[PDB]
Amino acid sequence: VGQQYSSAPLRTVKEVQFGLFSPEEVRAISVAKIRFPETMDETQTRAKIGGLNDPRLGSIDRNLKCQTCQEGMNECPGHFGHIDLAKPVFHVGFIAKIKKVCECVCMHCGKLLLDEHNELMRQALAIKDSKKRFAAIWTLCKTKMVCETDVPSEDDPTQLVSRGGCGNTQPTIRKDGLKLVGSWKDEPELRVLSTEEILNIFKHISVKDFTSLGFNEVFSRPEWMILTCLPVPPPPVRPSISFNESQRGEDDLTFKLADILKANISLETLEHNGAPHHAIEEAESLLQFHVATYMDNDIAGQPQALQKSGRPVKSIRARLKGKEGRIRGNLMGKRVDFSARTVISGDPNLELDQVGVPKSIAKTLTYPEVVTPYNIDRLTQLVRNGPNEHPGAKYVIRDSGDRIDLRYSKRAGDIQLQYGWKVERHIMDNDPVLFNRQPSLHKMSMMAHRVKVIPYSTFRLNLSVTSPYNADFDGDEMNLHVPQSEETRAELSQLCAVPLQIVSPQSNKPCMGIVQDTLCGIRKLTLRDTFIELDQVLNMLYWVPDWDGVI
Amino acid sequence: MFFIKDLSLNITLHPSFFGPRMKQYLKTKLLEEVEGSCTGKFGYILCVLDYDNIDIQRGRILPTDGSAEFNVKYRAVVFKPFKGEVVDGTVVSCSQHGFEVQVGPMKVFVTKHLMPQDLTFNAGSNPPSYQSSEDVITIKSRIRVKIEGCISQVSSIHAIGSIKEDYLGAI
Amino acid sequence: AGRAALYKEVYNVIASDGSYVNYRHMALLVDVMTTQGGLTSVTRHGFNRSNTGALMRCSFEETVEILFEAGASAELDDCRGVSENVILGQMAPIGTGAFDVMIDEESLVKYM
Amino acid sequence: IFVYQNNITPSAMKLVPSIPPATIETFNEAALVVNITHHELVPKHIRLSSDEKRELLKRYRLKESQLPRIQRADPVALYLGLKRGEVVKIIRKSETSGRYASYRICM
Amino acid sequence: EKAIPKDQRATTPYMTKYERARILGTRALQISMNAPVFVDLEGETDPLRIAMKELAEKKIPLVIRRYLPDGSFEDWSVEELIVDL
Amino acid sequence: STSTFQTRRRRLKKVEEEENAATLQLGQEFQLKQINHQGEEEELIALNLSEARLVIKEALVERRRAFKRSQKKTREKELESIDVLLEQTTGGNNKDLKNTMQYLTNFSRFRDQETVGAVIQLLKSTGLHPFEVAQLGSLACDTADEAKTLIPSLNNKISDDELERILKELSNLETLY
Amino acid sequence: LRFGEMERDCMIAHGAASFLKERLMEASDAFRVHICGICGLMTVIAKLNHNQFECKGCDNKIDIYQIHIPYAAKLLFQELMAMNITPRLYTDRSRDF
Amino acid sequence: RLVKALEDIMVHYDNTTRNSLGNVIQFIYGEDGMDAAHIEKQSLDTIGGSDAAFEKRYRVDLLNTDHTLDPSLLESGSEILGDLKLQVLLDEEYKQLVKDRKFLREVFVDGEANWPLPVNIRRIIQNAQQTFHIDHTKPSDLTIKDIVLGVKDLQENLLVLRGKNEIIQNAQRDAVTLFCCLLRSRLATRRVLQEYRLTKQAFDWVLSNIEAQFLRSVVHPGEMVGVLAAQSIGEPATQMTLNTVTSGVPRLKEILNVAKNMKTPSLTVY
DNA sequence: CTCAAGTACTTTTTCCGGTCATT
RNA sequence: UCGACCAGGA
DNA sequence: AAGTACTTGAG
Ligand SMILES: Nc1ncnc2c1ncn2[C@@H]1O[C@H](COP(=O)(O)CP(=O)(O)OP(=O)(O)O)[C@@H](O)[C@H]1O
Ligand SMILES: [Mg+2]
Numbered sequence A: 001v002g003q004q005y006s007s008a009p010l011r012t013v014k015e016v017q018f019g020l021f022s023p024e025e026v027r028a029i030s031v032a033k034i035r036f037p038e039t040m041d042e043t044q045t046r047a048k049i050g051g052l053n054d055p056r057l058g059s060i061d062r063n064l065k066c067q068t069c070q071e072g073m074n075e076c077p078g079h080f081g082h083i084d085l086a087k088p089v090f091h092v093g094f095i096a097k098i099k100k101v102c103e104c105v106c107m108h109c110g111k112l113l114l115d116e117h118n119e120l121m122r123q124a125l126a127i128k129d130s131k132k133r134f135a136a137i138w139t140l141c142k143t144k145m146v147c148e149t150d151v152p153s154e155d156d157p158t159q160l161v162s163r164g165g166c167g168n169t170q171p172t173i174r175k176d177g178l179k180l181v182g183s184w185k186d187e188p189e190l191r192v193l194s195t196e197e198i199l200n201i202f203k204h205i206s207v208k209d210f211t212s213l214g215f216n217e218v219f220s221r222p223e224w225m226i227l228t229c230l231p232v233p234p235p236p237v238r239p240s241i242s243f244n245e246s247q248r249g250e251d252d253l254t255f256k257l258a259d260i261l262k263a264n265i266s267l268e269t270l271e272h273n274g275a276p277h278h279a280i281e282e283a284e285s286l287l288q289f290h291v292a293t294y295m296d297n298d299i300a301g302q303p304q305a306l307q308k309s310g311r312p313v314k315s316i317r318a319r320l321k322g323k324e325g326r327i328r329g330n331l332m333g334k335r336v337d338f339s340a341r342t343v344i345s346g347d348p349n350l351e352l353d354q355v356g357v358p359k360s361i362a363k364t365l366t367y368p369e370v371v372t373p374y375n376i377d378r379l380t381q382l383v384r385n386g387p388n389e390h391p392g393a394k395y396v397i398r399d400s401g402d403r404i405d406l407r408y409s410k411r412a413g414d415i416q417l418q419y420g421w422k423v424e425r426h427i428m429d430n431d432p433v434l435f436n437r438q439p440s441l442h443k444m445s446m447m448a449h450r451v452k453v454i455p456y457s458t459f460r461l462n463l464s465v466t467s468p469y470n471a472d473f474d475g476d477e478m479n480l481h482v483p484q485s486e487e488t489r490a491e492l493s494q495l496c497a498v499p500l501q502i503v504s505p506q507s508n509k510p511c512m513g514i515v516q517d518t519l520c521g522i523r524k525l526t527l528r529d530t531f532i533e534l535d536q537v538l539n540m541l542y543w544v545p546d547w548d549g550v551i
Numbered sequence B: 001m002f003f004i005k006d007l008s009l010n011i012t013l014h015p016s017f018f019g020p021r022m023k024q025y026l027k028t029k030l031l032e033e034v035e036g037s038c039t040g041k042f043g044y045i046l047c048v049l050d051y052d053n054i055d056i057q058r059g060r061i062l063p064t065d066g067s068a069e070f071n072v073k074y075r076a077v078v079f080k081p082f083k084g085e086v087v088d089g090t091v092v093s094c095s096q097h098g099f100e101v102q103v104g105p106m107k108v109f110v111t112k113h114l115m116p117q118d119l120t121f122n123a124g125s126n127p128p129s130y131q132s133s134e135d136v137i138t139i140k141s142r143i144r145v146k147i148e149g150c151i152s153q154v155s156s157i158h159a160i161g162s163i164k165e166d167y168l169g170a171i
Numbered sequence C: 001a002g003r004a005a006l007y008k009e010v011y012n013v014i015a016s017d018g019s020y021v022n023y024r025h026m027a028l029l030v031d032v033m034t035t036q037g038g039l040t041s042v043t044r045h046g047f048n049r050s051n052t053g054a055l056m057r058c059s060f061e062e063t064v065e066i067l068f069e070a071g072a073s074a075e076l077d078d079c080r081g082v083s084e085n086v087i088l089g090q091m092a093p094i095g096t097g098a099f100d101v102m103i104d105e106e107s108l109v110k111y112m
Numbered sequence D: 001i002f003v004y005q006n007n008i009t010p011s012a013m014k015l016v017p018s019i020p021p022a023t024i025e026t027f028n029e030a031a032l033v034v035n036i037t038h039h040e041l042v043p044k045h046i047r048l049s050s051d052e053k054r055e056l057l058k059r060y061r062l063k064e065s066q067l068p069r070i071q072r073a074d075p076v077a078l079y080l081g082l083k084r085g086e087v088v089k090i091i092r093k094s095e096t097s098g099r100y101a102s103y104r105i106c107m
Numbered sequence E: 001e002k003a004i005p006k007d008q009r010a011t012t013p014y015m016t017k018y019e020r021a022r023i024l025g026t027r028a029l030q031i032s033m034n035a036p037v038f039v040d041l042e043g044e045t046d047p048l049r050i051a052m053k054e055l056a057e058k059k060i061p062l063v064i065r066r067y068l069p070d071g072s073f074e075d076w077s078v079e080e081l082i083v084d085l
Numbered sequence F: 001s002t003s004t005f006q007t008r009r010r011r012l013k014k015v016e017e018e019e020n021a022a023t024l025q026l027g028q029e030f031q032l033k034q035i036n037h038q039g040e041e042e043e044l045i046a047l048n049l050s051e052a053r054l055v056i057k058e059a060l061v062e063r064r065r066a067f068k069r070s071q072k073k074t075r076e077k078e079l080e081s082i083d084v085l086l087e088q089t090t091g092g093n094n095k096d097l098k099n100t101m102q103y104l105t106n107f108s109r110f111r112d113q114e115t116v117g118a119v120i121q122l123l124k125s126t127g128l129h130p131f132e133v134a135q136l137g138s139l140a141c142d143t144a145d146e147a148k149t150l151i152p153s154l155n156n157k158i159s160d161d162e163l164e165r166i167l168k169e170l171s172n173l174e175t176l177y
Numbered sequence G: 001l002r003f004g005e006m007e008r009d010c011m012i013a014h015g016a017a018s019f020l021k022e023r024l025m026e027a028s029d030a031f032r033v034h035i036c037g038i039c040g041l042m043t044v045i046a047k048l049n050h051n052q053f054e055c056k057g058c059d060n061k062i063d064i065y066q067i068h069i070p071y072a073a074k075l076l077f078q079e080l081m082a083m084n085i086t087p088r089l090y091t092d093r094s095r096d097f
Numbered sequence H: 001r002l003v004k005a006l007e008d009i010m011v012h013y014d015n016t017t018r019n020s021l022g023n024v025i026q027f028i029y030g031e032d033g034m035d036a037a038h039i040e041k042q043s044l045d046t047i048g049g050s051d052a053a054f055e056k057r058y059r060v061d062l063l064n065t066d067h068t069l070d071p072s073l074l075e076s077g078s079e080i081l082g083d084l085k086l087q088v089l090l091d092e093e094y095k096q097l098v099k100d101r102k103f104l105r106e107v108f109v110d111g112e113a114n115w116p117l118p119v120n121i122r123r124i125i126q127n128a129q130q131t132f133h134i135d136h137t138k139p140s141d142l143t144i145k146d147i148v149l150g151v152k153d154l155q156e157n158l159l160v161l162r163g164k165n166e167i168i169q170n171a172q173r174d175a176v177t178l179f180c181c182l183l184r185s186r187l188a189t190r191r192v193l194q195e196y197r198l199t200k201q202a203f204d205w206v207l208s209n210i211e212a213q214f215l216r217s218v219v220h221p222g223e224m225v226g227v228l229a230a231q232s233i234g235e236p237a238t239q240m241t242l243n244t245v246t247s248g249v250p251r252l253k254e255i256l257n258v259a260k261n262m263k264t265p266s267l268t269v270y
Numbered sequence I: 001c002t003c004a005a006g007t008a009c010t011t012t013t014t015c016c017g018g019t020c021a022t023t
Numbered sequence J: 001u002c003g004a005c006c007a008g009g010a
Numbered sequence K: 001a002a003g004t005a006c007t008t009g010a011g
């Protein structure tokens, strides 16, 4: 888990503070200045360029060598960089909220179009809920098309009282792709509001006013919805797919950043050099496009920013977007170790709470047991049995913290087990295991079972536990999970065990009874005409494992 | 200057020590960590006071490893130096660069130029001295210094002092 | 009276296919849609819009947008929901983790 | 309480909060023909005193938000002239407990 | 300060299914971690089977901190809690 | 690392505290008003050399008693006697506490608890910071000019004759060798 | 095998908290990061062999903790940051309730 | 959807049902605070039947020579006649049973007397008979006081909510309301003596095993009551499709979506 | 300056070998 | 060692 | 497909 001892105290996350990155912070957080669209290859040399993809950042080639931070690959997380944009550009996500904030504040002095003077406004400001308060204030100020100098006083409407200065008509802002256009006024004046324009207006919005809107003085100022300083994610986020030595291969996100950096370098040259004024707006809108397209590529306005192939390009949004997305596909559900799955078969000679585990499966799955004086002697015979005998073990984990592969280790024959060590041993009869059958629409679809190591390649299971799983033996497969803790074992054996699951709370009745052969035969056996002679009766009685011994 | 400070420490025990003499090991552990320590925040944690009434509290068992964590609240004698703080000390080291003075656990180095002009180096002596028209400063001589500044070099604090100002110097 | 009617209708769609569900479960779903003061749909439009954890709500239907508005309005997540702990890889405050376990020295010396 | 026939001028209806501490309530005749509170599905809602309420939140260790809410516009809330923050104790009949009582804070 | 006094406790005097399961697992893990045992292991070797004897004899030295929705809590000893389950 | 008594958190706010001095601006940690074990307000505790030596002695002496309980089933000479107790109650590797106990024994002005408490009653009636109150009990001064130069916090806080009355009572209170 | 969302729900229903954790962490993703106690980000340039911790930008070389989170959660927060969103992780509380 | 809506809802150590915000959904789980596994359908013989048959079944009149408990039912039967003090006890008893009847007929308007409740009382009496080899020949050792006061006292012990205040003690009183109706129905002085034929010994055993069973039957704080409920409605619906007026999956969709324009709006007018 | 209609957006059960191109 | 299509299982 | 959440447009 992250590997190697750290002196830093171990804590649990108790709060998650969402906010926006301020340019100032993006610069401070950054380890490298990222200025070249070229990843690596310091002209031919197979070493990374001091300008993108480790201009200091994370690491490649499994080199501890990671900007003196050492560690490397499994240990060192990524290290963020930055790229200073030539002009400010909108963040795709906040594009609408920027519009809605412009629709609320005077586009000249930055004062809220509505004041404590308007009675409906006082009521909207009284809203406790940050999002509902924003909503009410917007619906109110969108209407106001003038930054009033004076409004009638609370007493007589005859005498007017002066508020925040300047007149100025407010534009009727509308979206046009990734741009904001106004309509001030026979016939109106229609121009595009610049990213810089919006910004200096937002920078002028007072704390009182913007905190009256969704925003937070410390964590999310309205001005931070516009991008000035772009954060460069490290390689662990955008890994380079190497398919030999010579076969370089970089990620999609690496291409888009290089493209932003390509677009930037052009815009900056046009400005810092002979400004052609109307070519600058072209190179500016291109930067806007790329920064947009990198965070979102499933945008309303048709250009899919296709990679020359015919492929669209995975935006950062697309990465997290549910089922397969980082949230639903990587965090709400994961692929797991200590798992097994094979075809299931019905066994009448199994206990309700047992599960037939094929020796193959028992020999691969492992429970890590701590070398305790209680087990010390048994555990040694398992380690000495090795990974090939059935009751055996696969690894010995030392106090030092280092795995011993009994399959190879020159000392596999030896090993004098010290206490406190762990012995990853083959699953044995009566270990608790979580057994399940998909689709798992029940508390009962997953139950804890005792192991019974048997020959032949299927999971054998008692026929009366068929119903809760809703399993048939026409080629159904089932999943097995092996707990690794002595406390996790208890969890299963004490809450999830099959005997416990017998009476179901969804129906207030038992979810498993006698089925098929045993049910058909129980009727046949019962009825008054059925009589059993001594010879057979005695065999019938012996068959009851708890028979009192009384004929 | 020497303070008494009400402090805490989160020690994490291991199940093997969940025996009758647990408190003893925790108290003994607190001392290991805390006593003789030096942080910038509180300075030198010199001695844990009132061993008898050390508060261990109820320790919480951490999930997936039975190890229990206790916030051991306590009280200790600390030494935290400051700028402008006047100290009495003894000379330890002495070179052409100046002389270092031991002030409690900490050392205060007095630069050649943070001394009066008349007081100059004398290499030709065992031990090497700083000689004045009247005074003589050497490896066992007692001094009074003004702490001009502090630095927190890991598990220590070092200061730069002056004996240039009035009422300061040799004692 | 809304709750009454809502339960009545839910109950009958279940009883429609013979199937029996113990009151409490339908009662709970009905109670949930209701407590808010109105009829809260079991959609992204209804439940997923409440004052619950950002990480918890982004775990269903409107993911990236939920998270974007989290930053833009500086949301603070309690980390009280199951979903949040599951994202954080922390022992959820669920059943077995709905309480804390302590060692008492008083009893540790008493048991020897 | 002002009981109108068909309507009231939007001019006239915007004179209701003009006389505090006192309050005004508009009701249409056709709406009042039937006492909706008498219906099968409508349980007994009961207004809680400042102290009754204060005590409830103490005993259930609740913040005002944590309580299930009744809308101000709610037919029964209108019948009892419920004011923002007032709490009603709803006594209903249970197929499970026999009698179960909930509470609703005003909107 | 949140912490209900012994005399003012109001939660089930009985141990929950979830409580017993976490106590039994915790001690099992601890007995396996090479912790000291407050019971006669009468030929016993499985730490859960040991932890069970300890809870049976009510010689488990742990306390459950039952947290209430307002943060306040009640501390109950495994010695205190009734084990009908 | 050892955790404090004060809990005044810095939510995102990077901005750190200003420099420290004898403008009596110590840390946030070393404020005048601070949090007690009971969660009470309590004034900063600052000790002078000798007030500080006796406190450490008291603790280790009663720790040696606790170490002997558990194990059931004159300046030149005060330095050796102290160094013996250290070998018995301290971890040895506490190089700081040895140098400190030597410094305190060879720099303390008042030997006996009586003379220390008398100095404590004398000064703690001026209403000066525990800093000034301790510094006055630490550095031996003759003039109110001497005192007010070295402890430049004092400057307007006390009368020149008043401070000198104390300085001259602290002299008559100084322990011999 | 994929321990699906459905599979998680059953474990919740059961009350197996410590198990759910073992599945999702120990038996998969489980990773260790060093986070800063001022700006709750995975910054901390933690050279472990030397025992140096530091979060430049906060200048803080002291108020640094270590958390255990699923690697994909590390990844998530890094992706959110790349999108100018600050998912600040704090190991204390403020709000109460 | 049902799962993601209900996830975070669980029972807290205060028997209140709350979400991740600590907002109360149910004040007590399923209005009764009982774990659904520990619930069996049981009849309420106070609901149905003629008003005559009821009086036959439960009325004991120690002041009337015909309607007394026969001295073949209990030992005290002979000296019990005319005991105005004990008739006072038996009057409250019956008066409460009549109250009960009115209440139950109020709750279940159709007269349906078979409802799922905790503690299967039948099985407890059924066992007491086979346990104590109850001979339906000899008279009982029980007193009118033994039965009447015994049941009264059992009730005070069927705790769900513990709270020493009055809001909680009233909430306690309320959650048991129906089970007590069932309790008093089944343990009337007449019914215990004439029907069951219980010895004092058996009665104390029945009384303890009701308390015992009841207590176990209550919900456990931590119970993931939220998820449970979602799968309990979910699984049926998912099976009610997998196997080969708007109703079923489409109407359930209508309901959960709080669909405005619904397909079959109807209005039943009485 | 109200309210009808047109505008756009976002969901769609769970787990579990071959062939293509290109990384 | 990367992920898209197609074909399948309960 | 069915909400939502807006613009766009008539009287
Ligand atoms: N598309 C699908 N999605 C989820 N589960 C499925 C599925 N197809 C089949 N199943 C699972 O398989 C179960 C029934 O399918 P089968 O087993 O193939 C029919 P059978 O039981 O063999 O005979 P039958 O046709 O007489 O019922 C379902 O209840 C379900 O659990
Ligand atoms: Mg099948």
Ligand SMILES: [Zn+2]
Binding pocket: A057, A058, A066, A069, A070, A071, A072, A076, A077, A078, A079
């Ligand atoms: Zn690194």
Ligand SMILES: [Zn+2]
Binding pocket: A106, A107, A108, A109, A110, A111, A147, A165, A166, A167, A168
């Ligand atoms: Zn203006």
Ligand SMILES: [Zn+2]
Binding pocket: G036, G037, G038, G039, G040, G041, G043, G055, G056, G057, G058, G059, G060
């Ligand atoms: Zn930081």
